[PDB]
Design a protein around this motif. Sequence first.
Motif, PDB file in Angstrom:
ATOM      1  N   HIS B  96      -2.022   2.535   3.033  1.00 46.60           N
ATOM      2  CA  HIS B  96      -2.414   3.105   2.093  1.00 46.60           C
ATOM      3  C   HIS B  96      -3.256   4.349   2.038  1.00 46.60           C
ATOM      4  N   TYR B 284      -4.197  -8.075   3.845  1.00 45.33           N
ATOM      5  CA  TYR B 284      -5.097  -6.414   2.245  1.00 45.33           C
ATOM      6  C   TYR B 284      -4.276  -5.453   2.287  1.00 45.33           C
ATOM      7  N   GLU B 285      -3.083  -4.835   2.629  1.00 48.14           N
ATOM      8  CA  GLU B 285      -2.588  -4.101   2.386  1.00 48.14           C
ATOM      9  C   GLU B 285      -0.802  -4.135   2.195  1.00 48.14           C
ATOM     10  N   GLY B 286      -0.167  -5.157   2.622  1.00 51.07           N
ATOM     11  CA  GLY B 286       1.142  -4.894   2.535  1.00 51.07           C
ATOM     12  C   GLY B 286       2.016  -5.348   3.185  1.00 51.07           C
ATOM     13  N   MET B 287       3.086  -5.725   3.001  1.00 51.53           N
ATOM     14  CA  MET B 287       3.610  -6.040   4.773  1.00 51.53           C
ATOM     15  C   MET B 287       4.268  -4.494   6.042  1.00 51.53           C
ATOM     16  N   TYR B 290       5.736  -1.210   5.253  1.00 50.27           N
ATOM     17  CA  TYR B 290       5.709  -0.623   4.105  1.00 50.27           C
ATOM     18  C   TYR B 290       4.033  -0.577   3.711  1.00 50.27           C
ATOM     19  N   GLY B 292       1.358  -1.310   1.698  1.00 49.94           N
ATOM     20  CA  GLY B 292       0.473  -1.218   0.496  1.00 49.94           C
ATOM     21  C   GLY B 292       1.542   0.544   0.106  1.00 49.94           C
ATOM     22  N   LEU B 293       2.133   1.402   0.666  1.00 51.37           N
ATOM     23  CA  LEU B 293       2.760   2.199   0.199  1.00 51.37           C
ATOM     24  C   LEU B 293       4.245   2.237  -0.424  1.00 51.37           C
ATOM     25  N   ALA B 294       4.381   3.228  -1.355  1.00 49.38           N
ATOM     26  CA  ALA B 294       5.882   3.142  -1.949  1.00 49.38           C
ATOM     27  C   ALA B 294       6.681   3.808  -0.577  1.00 49.38           C
TER      28      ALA B 294
END
Lengths: 455, 455, 455, 455
Positions: B96, B284-287, B290, B292-294
């Motif tokens: 992110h 912590y962030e996302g897959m 992505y 943790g970002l759009a």
Amino acid sequence: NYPAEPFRIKSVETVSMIPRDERLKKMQEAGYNTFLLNSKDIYIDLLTDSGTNAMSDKQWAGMMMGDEAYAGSENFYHLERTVQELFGFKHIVPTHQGRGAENLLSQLAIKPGQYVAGNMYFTTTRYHQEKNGAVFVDIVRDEAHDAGLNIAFKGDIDLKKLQKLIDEKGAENIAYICLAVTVNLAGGQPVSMANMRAVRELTEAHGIKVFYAATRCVENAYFIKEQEQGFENKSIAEIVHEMFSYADGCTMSGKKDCLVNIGGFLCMNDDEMFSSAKELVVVYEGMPSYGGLAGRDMEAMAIGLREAMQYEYIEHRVKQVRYLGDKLKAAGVPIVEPVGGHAVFLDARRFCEHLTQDEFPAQSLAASIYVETGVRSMERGIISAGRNNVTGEHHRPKLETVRLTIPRRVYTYAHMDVVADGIIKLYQHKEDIRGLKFIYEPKQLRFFTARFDYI
Amino acid sequence: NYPAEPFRIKSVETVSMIPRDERLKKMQEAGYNTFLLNSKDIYIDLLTDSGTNAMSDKQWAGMMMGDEAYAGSENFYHLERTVQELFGFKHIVPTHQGRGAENLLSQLAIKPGQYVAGNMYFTTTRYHQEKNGAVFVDIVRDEAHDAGLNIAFKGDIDLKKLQKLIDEKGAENIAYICLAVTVNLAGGQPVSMANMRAVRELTEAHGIKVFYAATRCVENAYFIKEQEQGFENKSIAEIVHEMFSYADGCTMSGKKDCLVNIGGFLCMNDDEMFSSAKELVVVYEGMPSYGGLAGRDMEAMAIGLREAMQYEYIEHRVKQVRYLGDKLKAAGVPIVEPVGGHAVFLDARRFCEHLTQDEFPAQSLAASIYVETGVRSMERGIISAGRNNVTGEHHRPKLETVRLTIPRRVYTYAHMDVVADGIIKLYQHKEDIRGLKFIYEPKQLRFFTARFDYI
Amino acid sequence: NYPAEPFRIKSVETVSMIPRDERLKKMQEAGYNTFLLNSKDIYIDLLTDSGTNAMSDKQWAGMMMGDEAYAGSENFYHLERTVQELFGFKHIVPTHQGRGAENLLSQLAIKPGQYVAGNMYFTTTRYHQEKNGAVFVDIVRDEAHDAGLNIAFKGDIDLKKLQKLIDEKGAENIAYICLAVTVNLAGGQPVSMANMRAVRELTEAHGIKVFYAATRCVENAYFIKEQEQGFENKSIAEIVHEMFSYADGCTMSGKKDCLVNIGGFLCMNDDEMFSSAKELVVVYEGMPSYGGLAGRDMEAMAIGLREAMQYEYIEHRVKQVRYLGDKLKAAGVPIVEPVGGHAVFLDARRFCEHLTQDEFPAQSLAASIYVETGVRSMERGIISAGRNNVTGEHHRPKLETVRLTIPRRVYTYAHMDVVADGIIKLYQHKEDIRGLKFIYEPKQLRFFTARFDYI
Amino acid sequence: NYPAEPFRIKSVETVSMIPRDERLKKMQEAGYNTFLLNSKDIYIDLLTDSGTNAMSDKQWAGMMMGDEAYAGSENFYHLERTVQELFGFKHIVPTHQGRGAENLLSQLAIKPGQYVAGNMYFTTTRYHQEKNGAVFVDIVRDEAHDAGLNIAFKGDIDLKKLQKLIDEKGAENIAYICLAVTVNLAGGQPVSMANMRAVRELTEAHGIKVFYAATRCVENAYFIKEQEQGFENKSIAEIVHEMFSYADGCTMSGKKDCLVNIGGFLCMNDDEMFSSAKELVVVYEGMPSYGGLAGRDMEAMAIGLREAMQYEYIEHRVKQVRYLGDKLKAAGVPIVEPVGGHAVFLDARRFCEHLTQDEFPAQSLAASIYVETGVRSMERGIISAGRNNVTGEHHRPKLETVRLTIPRRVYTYAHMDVVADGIIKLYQHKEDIRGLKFIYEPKQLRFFTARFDYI
Ligand SMILES: *Cc1c(COP(=O)(O)O)cnc(C)c1O
Ligand SMILES: *Cc1c(COP(=O)(O)O)cnc(C)c1O
Ligand SMILES: *Cc1c(COP(=O)(O)O)cnc(C)c1O
Ligand SMILES: *Cc1c(COP(=O)(O)O)cnc(C)c1O
Ligand SMILES: [K+]
Ligand SMILES: [K+]
Ligand SMILES: [K+]
Ligand SMILES: [K+]
């Protein structure tokens, strides 16, 4: 003296920073006509201040809330009430831009054989007036035609000329007075509140209508604020509202002082004229509830007109233009004076005094400016004036100018320096600027597509 | 020496133009801590260059094409191939922002009891390193700590310090070298290609890994192009790619040099590291697709990184900061030298020689600056350094500075003049600047919400 | 037979979910005229398919890349090359919407006293034609006037009527044939390729020009693909291109089949016509390089026209309208047949057999529909037909309809069910629908602002 | 029964309508793993309801007004006051999404050796709890583990299990209760207000904290509204506010019920915990004033959370999912019951009873669904469960499911029909579905990149 931008940059427009030798090739492929240049090849585009403005974040938020309904759109209602509040007129009819409003106004207010009198004219507006059978009579003060005369409020109507017209042709034979703010043909010159009031008073006594061609009315309000005694404690909104209190209606180009890329409107107080306008608008523009605009543009224009009332914004807008003119004048570069609200006009007749008007000094100077700086400017001289189709001779205008027209909120003082420094450097060797000759000349609209080569 | 903005303004951000007396009241309501000011009350916000950048029209177009899929997004594929092309690493993992990437790296590359050595440190990164049980060793050249000293490539690693570490501790006990570009704590100072090469040569001989904290790597590439002999014919892109060829991976804050408002990533070449990274990012962030970002932000960052490679853009970015520092210097205002890529740091110790560090000269200078100009700046001194938990005394940093941090593409030279002119006026009466004392001190993160009054 | 939407929803428009009793109060405040309802008060707005379309993500991305230059805009070049490729005409002139293009065409192609013949007419177009001194002759096949008759290609020209015109008046006295696709006044009925060919063959033999009023040409191309034998292996794009190969030019409303909210254009092959067109567009619309549109709208329209060529998009568009008509028909609700490309027209004469046309059954049906469902529809009967100025009597059109006009990509089948179910419920108690009478009638454009009460 | 969409489509997302034979080739290139498919190749993507939602026009207007300031952003203040108003908590800390909030919560509230008890668990959340030294204890009611049992409020905590934990380990050894709404592992099952209150009352008596993992709290509030006696006159906002009045704080994923593509937050009442959270957030996410989010995303999430309270919106959201499950159930297709708020789970063990769990029936069914319809679904069975790294054996979950996860406001009932009809057709010949075997298996995160071929 010169204020900093009373805003931040939210987003930027990517430019090609092509160097001099590449700009020369582009200028050649355009036949030395700045009108033929590709936008992608231009660093700083001063062709026009119409429709080229940067919108705010708030206007872009508005653009996301377009209510695209054919009738009853929230955006229409927002534009309507904003213009009623700020301009003070009863009835508002959106139009896709200013000349759409003028087309309507001419049909609503002119009987064939009547006179329309104004403080100079605008090409398209005069076309609409004449198409409806009017004769145009210029009643601007004499000083307006002297491009060198440094005086305030050069756009003022000469009340004596208006008096003479009334005496000679009769009031009932005058369709209306068309009062423009600011005045294009004099270089963007303002009109004083005193003049507006005097005009209202004379016309009202005779039952004559007054309609404002109000395209740069906010620049105008700033000049009143700065230079007309008695207006120093008044807000820009208060001055604008007073200006329009002396008219029966107006035509407006949102594309100029409403800070948008498209949009305009027609205003009036008269119920019968409004009824009639509604029928005509449908024919040329669209329903009275959108007038040839997307709902998001009615919203962007409603927002922008309100942003234009901020003192710091318009003070900066006008002083940025002034900065460019001051820097040019200090170096000896000949310009139209005083500098107008929206543009600096280079006097290319004086700048290129070694060239005859037949060698197109304004067109050639505009080409040189682009090659030296990446700046596009507009020829406003013999080329734009076009040919006399009866005689085949050039129309030879008294003004032979290059127009450095400044979009609102797009450029910085450093861009103004790029423009000025390049022009100042060209001036220092002005005798080297070569004349042009046609290699291709269209029969119509020759400024738009003509091509040249150097003599 | 100062180029015009190599772009036009597409849209503007509305700002409050509130006068001095009202700014004083806002500053007082903020307890004289600029960190507590409301954004809506600030004309020019120089708190940070991180995440505050103006995007282009092309990035905003990318923002409309956000492919929001959890895996397989076109935006992820665009970011991935852009980073592979421009930075040259095999594997990319979005995060992110930068400290998310540092969190992963610290967990992937550190065994308990090892050392991490670098050219100074970023506070949050050092936190992660130590949480994973590393001891941080500063191997920056000594000059980096001398605020006033005007030498090139102040951010360079001292190779003799590196050698000493290797000899004293053993290579197997060094997790990695963390090489930052540019160096925050020295005031945004760059690192030369020669140093990056020499660091790589020495470490590789000993089997020690190098990872870059690359947050302002494009600013750094500009300093190399301008100042390191042998790089004059190279593009910014060629320089960036070569810089990264001397590393095993990097952490990146897109919020700085990729010209976006959010976003970062982690890169590496090693396959096993990449596999473990995929497992950690999820928690912590996302897959990994992505992080943790759009999707639209992966797209903006992919676009922004490529825009950053344009010479004129980064030349202007760095020379605009330089202009502010040059103007301050010419008036005798004490600053950290040379001016860094992203900020000018006022040396508040020298500015306010009549105040002791215990009277918080940087905090008080930042307050006066806002009051006089509408400009927000960041305290980077004793307040930000925080309190010792064992002794209860201030950490008293050597550098006591006010950071004038410049967001990319947001401000003009006229904004820089507003900043400089107000600071020069304050400096002309520097003796009048009053000391501050706490009236409220939080136990944690004190610079964020602490409140003061004048002594 | 009804495909799913061949797209996903990217963003949604917030709507008022106000209950029946509150809708009744809005309808009463609107004096039972749906034209007076506020957009904010409407759940499903079927007033028109013109300008009310949902754009795609790709068009919105194009909207961020608006190149607002007065000449040489990338968006103009994109629109120009898209129209040349897809419609196959040499020259394109943008206009703010379709009636702007018709205004130019009428002035360019009509000599005083000539006839214009076409398959029925659009009100504003007929106005321009007659203002230029043409007499309009309707050469549509007779079946087009029979609302209930279910035959294919109802919009076709009667070639025998065309032949009769040529023999009675002489070819030199016909300005041009105006061939509309699809045909509004027959309820959105298509024209076959065979008819376009035969019309071209007959006119060309006599030296008579053909211009298309092409506003729903892609809907028309779909009917050809689905129903005209020999077109089953052709793409929508191949069909569109062939249609235009039978014309000398066209007027286009991008607001309909180019999937935008504003925009149109004029095309022609003739160079002299194009030159004269350039002079005229300036006075009414804007320079030939923008034609009264923002750069971003030329871009959206260029994108939208290409999106319209996707088979699944236009198949779904037309079959969604068909679904609404099929569901109404299955319940015995009287509609114009076959269902057109863009709307279902309720036959209010048959719906309200207990009311005389002088009691305004279409107006009253439209009112009840809004009250029962939150759905706005358009009166297309005696009210819209207006009053005879000589006799003072209503123009009493044969078709007395309520138009359920479907914007492209805005609604789902579940919205169509809301519409159908409410109309079927009303039809089950059709006798209860009450007649209306004027309580306010404007002299001009009466359908827009007239107010009624129940008899 | 099934309501129409309580919105219109404002903009659309372009899809490729690739036919069956081309989808099969894509599915092959993806190694029959739907996680490997490109988003550009998918018609209807039901991989997840997280971060895939369609925003409103109003949220997009918000996106244009991002105030990107590091501290004091208007967007932060708007999110703050919206969550305080709607959720009722004192302190709000934004995070980039839900697992960022959970990372913080675990560090703030867990001493090593303590127990965390909840109604089932979420993989990433449990990782954070265990990393902080907690042991997870499942206290959901027994019925939740019976995927076939059609009963209301299956997500409820068994108060007796909570009572037993307290008795056996002591209250002081319980870190907190983690109450999830809705409950993922039971198929999206809601929790009653009665249960929330009973849990608050028992825990408060013992001094135990309760924190909500509130990711689908709005879906949850809709179930309470529909099915819990006493809530029929309460608004969704009133139910949501009451739900949270029984917690000490919450973790929230904006990406689910706040109708955004990115975003989350952590809430709490305790001043000391808030002080501590502020220090930790800086390390992992960003300053407490943005928490790893762009200002425009804090704005979009503040707007979306408020839009989520509209009754008609959430009623439609949940009934659309229900429509899909009802249609499947009516055809005999085995699903988890009752259908949850956000997804329908196919029982692939029952659907493919001819396959052993070792042949990956859920993975194979998901592949078949894509090839037959263009619909992507998620494997939630043996593949996702991963391997036991100690033994090398598959973890063999009791749930072998395909998850049809529905993004909010993206799809219509016709898309639900495409999904259902394709699955129903596959069911009619279910015995033909072939098993899969690995051809490539990663050591970690195997569901994300594993590849298969048919047995
Ligand atoms: C610009 C202008 C117009 C025309 O308005 P558009 O919006 O360009 O059509 C008319 N009159 C005056 C005085 C103008 O300045
Ligand atoms: C900014 C920065 C970071 C942190 O990145 P964020 O995007 O702010 O999280 C880490 N290291 C260095 C050297 C930085 O400059
Ligand atoms: C819509 C239409 C017009 C007018 O176009 P606008 O874009 O509404 O101005 C003209 N002719 C036909 C056949 C139409 O359908
Ligand atoms: C989705 C979810 C999470 C994680 O939130 P993200 O925003 O995906 O990180 C945590 N707990 C529950 C119960 C969830 O549903
Ligand atoms: K424009
Ligand atoms: K930001
Ligand atoms: K519209
Ligand atoms: K997303």
